[PDB]
Amino acid sequence: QPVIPVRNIYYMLTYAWGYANLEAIPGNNLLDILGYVLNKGVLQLSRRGLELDYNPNTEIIPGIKGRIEFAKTIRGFHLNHGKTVSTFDMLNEDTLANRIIKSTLAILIKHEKLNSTIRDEARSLYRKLPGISTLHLTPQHFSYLNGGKNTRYYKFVISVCKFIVNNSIPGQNKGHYRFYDFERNEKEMSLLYQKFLYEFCRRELTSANTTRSYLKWDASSISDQSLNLLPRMETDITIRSSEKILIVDAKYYKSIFSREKFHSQNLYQLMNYLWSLKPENGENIGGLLIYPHVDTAVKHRYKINGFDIGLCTVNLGQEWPCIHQELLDIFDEYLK
Amino acid sequence: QPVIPVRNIYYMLTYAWGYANLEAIPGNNLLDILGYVLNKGVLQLSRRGLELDYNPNTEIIPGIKGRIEFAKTIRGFHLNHGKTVSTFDMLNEDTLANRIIKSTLAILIKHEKLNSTIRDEARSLYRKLPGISTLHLTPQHFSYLNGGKNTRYYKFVISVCKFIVNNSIPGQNKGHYRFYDFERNEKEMSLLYQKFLYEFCRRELTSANTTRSYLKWDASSISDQSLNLLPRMETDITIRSSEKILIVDAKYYKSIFSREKFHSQNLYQLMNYLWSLKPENGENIGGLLIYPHVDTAVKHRYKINGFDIGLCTVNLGQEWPCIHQELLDIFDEYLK
Amino acid sequence: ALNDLFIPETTIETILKRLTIKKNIILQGPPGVGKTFVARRLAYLLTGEKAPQRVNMVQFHQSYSYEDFIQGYRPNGVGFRRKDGIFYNFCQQAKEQPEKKYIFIIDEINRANLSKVFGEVMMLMEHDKRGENWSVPLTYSENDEERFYVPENVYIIGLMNTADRSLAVVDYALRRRFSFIDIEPGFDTPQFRNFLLNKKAEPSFVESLCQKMNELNQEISKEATILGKGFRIGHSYFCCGLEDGTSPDTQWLNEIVMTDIAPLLEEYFFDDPYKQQKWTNKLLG
Ligand SMILES: Nc1nc2c(ncn2[C@@H]2O[C@H](COP(=O)(O)OP(=O)(O)O)[C@@H](O)[C@H]2O)c(=O)[nH]1
């Protein structure tokens, strides 16, 4: 049951969310890394200052604050017992975003398997936020925050918070929590990898233009113009440049990690994308299959059906910069 | 959780193995049907006569039977105590094939959920075979019988016996057995359907010639002539006729049973088979996707990439003869 | 008030001991188990007389306040006038007749905030701190000398609905004082069957009806964390609607299944309607 070293995994999330030294922490397992990110990450926000959103408050007070609501005032007859119904703007850190952080920290502490230092430091931080109210978190709360009025920095940790909550399982005890075995399932690993490249290519490949492209079948049907029964076909990524276009399909498989038979089932999808796609520029058409491997990286090229296609792998577990170097070396060959 | 009526399933196995009234039995569930087949099936063999294979016996007896083995005779000095070591041919029903039947019947009786009549009648039959020795069955035993010296009839029930043993699970009690939920998993259902058609087409479509065809990629690679990394591509079926060839890919899906999005992922495989395949005769090229549906049957045609392709379904649960009629109606349209 | 009560004798007898001591009980349970009915009849039992006058009933809601409950200043034609509440007035009758037992019925207590409502008085209504000794002047009292003291005679009944998913945590201030009691649906009980057999219901339909609902009620209790045990359906639907002498039969039942039970399942099972169809079928089929 061999898997990727965990420290490298965190980098892939960075590109996945589109936005530090990990050598310092001695805990190989993921939650030690991610918990340290949040626990240290919170400190950066607090130094500059946490988000303060004016929440209006309509309450019954012994005096005038802001705007009096005449209707509620007389109806409750609060004038006689020296009270008014007035609307005013308390400035708090009680926003939905900040509550998530504090509620999240409870889960992080409650996790049964964790570094002692990480749990200790956060509990002070949990104590350091008295005004904010704890919450019982659901994805719908994170869903509400897609507006992103908050800064770019806030969205980073919240994206992490989204990862932790979904990847948290109750363990031995009713109260405490246990971390998900993220590594073992390919599907979430796969969706990460596809998302990892798509946002990554925008960053580094400034030379080329990169977009996900929807394609429509060349078919015509007497029955239906819809062709609803036909499969929806949406590229993982297309990375177009003036001299050559290139479509890529990448996935994480466990069998391919083994150095025997080879899993290239996704290739069946790839060719069909090439065929229905017709280039107006007509510069060239190229294809790529890239998969994760652990030990070493091997690159091949093919001339299959009049198309120039490459199958390649990357030596995950090597080093993050050389891996970053490795992709730029890779794409340059085929992007030509 | 809707599934196919069970009585119809048995017919699909018939074509799967390549070789009766099922209305008589009142038990809808599968093992009631299949157990009744074996329990009645055994009776047909016994009437004609069970297989008797001469098994040589070398034993120490008080006299001469067949050929005396001089070496073992003197070495044990059996001459002096009036005994000889001789090789002779007892004629028994103790063959591996027949032992499987008797051992199988124990499992059938031991199954916890079963019709009373089925269990009662077999126990007599279990009693009716005294000489034969019980066995603890494994697939390796069935594997040894691939030689098939036995008649065509014997192989039928044994094929059933292969199905039952694999699809038997211990249930509530240590001793008793419980039947597998065959219907729910698509994979075994799928391999049945692919096998169901392949042997079925040989029977009915005498007009056309039907073979499974291996295909080789059009690619060339500088790295390797092997192209081991490339996927192995083997047709489910090809049904070639002088006027037109046709390749079919068929699978059993649960989502498609629902009348929404459509699962046509296998189609990606189908087109690629058409491309690498080049016809020497050059009469025509056609494609078919056929899936199982429950309620009703719908047929569509397409002109996709210069190829004439059909997507169709069959109303399983209707009736076995009309379904048999339905396929012949289906293939004739596209086989043209 | 005890001729045909579907609930077992144990709880209703246990309550009588519990109430005579603690004087602050919460009766939990699914809606449609006669939470008002059992307590209303029990209210007569503790008194021993089937008399309504001593008994008073109020339904709490989020905006129910100290003004309605106890004392408020609603206006007369010209100027503001202090107006007695329900509980405030309620005690004045009990003070005259200490030998007698006066009982206060509070439906859906969890919904409202007890503190804003009771305020000062929440200390007093606890069983120990009762009588003139614990008397306190009220908030709106102009003169300190006038006080409100809870007599020991008072017995307080609170009804809480378990069914709501929106409920997360019971109020702390509520929990410290009241003695919670769990009321089962009691779909399988002697007196409920004995009531049903007295009406023109054959044993098979009774055995059919009681057994099948038990399977459904068992399902909801089975998934403990997913849905509370108290979510399980009660029996009050089968009581009412038969006043005219109507014979209960499966033809009659299917209306109640569709009319009354179906929305109840619909809210409880909000994820998969096919799962609802699994359970609706067994009720009739
Ligand atoms: N005769 C009789 N009626 C009952 C019994 N349980 C409930 N009922 C009646 O069911 C109806 C509803 O009672 P209730 O629980 O207060 O309604 P809720 O507010 O929805 O909870 C009233 O007519 C009750 O008297 C019972 O055990 N016996």
The ordered H/E elements of chain A are HHEEHEHHHHEEHEEEEEHEEEH
How large, in whole angstroms, is the Cα Rg of chain A? 26 Å
The percentage of residues in β strands of chain C lies in: 5-15%
What's the number of domains of chain C?
A: 2
Strand proportion of chain A, as a percent range, falls in 15-25%
- Identify the strand order in the major beta sheet of chain A: 6-9-10-11-13-12
* Alpha-beta content class of chain C: alpha/beta
Name the shape of chain A in a single word.
Answer: globular
- Main beta-sheet annotation of chain A: 6 strands, mixed
Largest interface: A-B, 31 and 32 residues
End-to-end separation of chain C? 38 Å
- Main sheet overview of chain C: 5 strands, parallel
Overall 3D shape of chain C: elongated
Distance between the termini of chain A: 38 Å
Radius of gyration of chain C over all CA atoms, rounded? 22 Å
Please estimate the helix content of chain C: 40-55%
Bound molecules: guanosine-5'-diphosphate
Number of strands of chain A: 13
Which assembly state applies to the chains in this document?
part of a larger assembly
Number of helices of chain A: 10
GO biological process, one term (chains A, B): DNA restriction-modification system
GO molecular function, one term (chains A, B): type IV site-specific deoxyribonuclease activity
Keywords (chains A, B): Restriction system
Organism (chains A, B): Escherichia coli (strain K12)
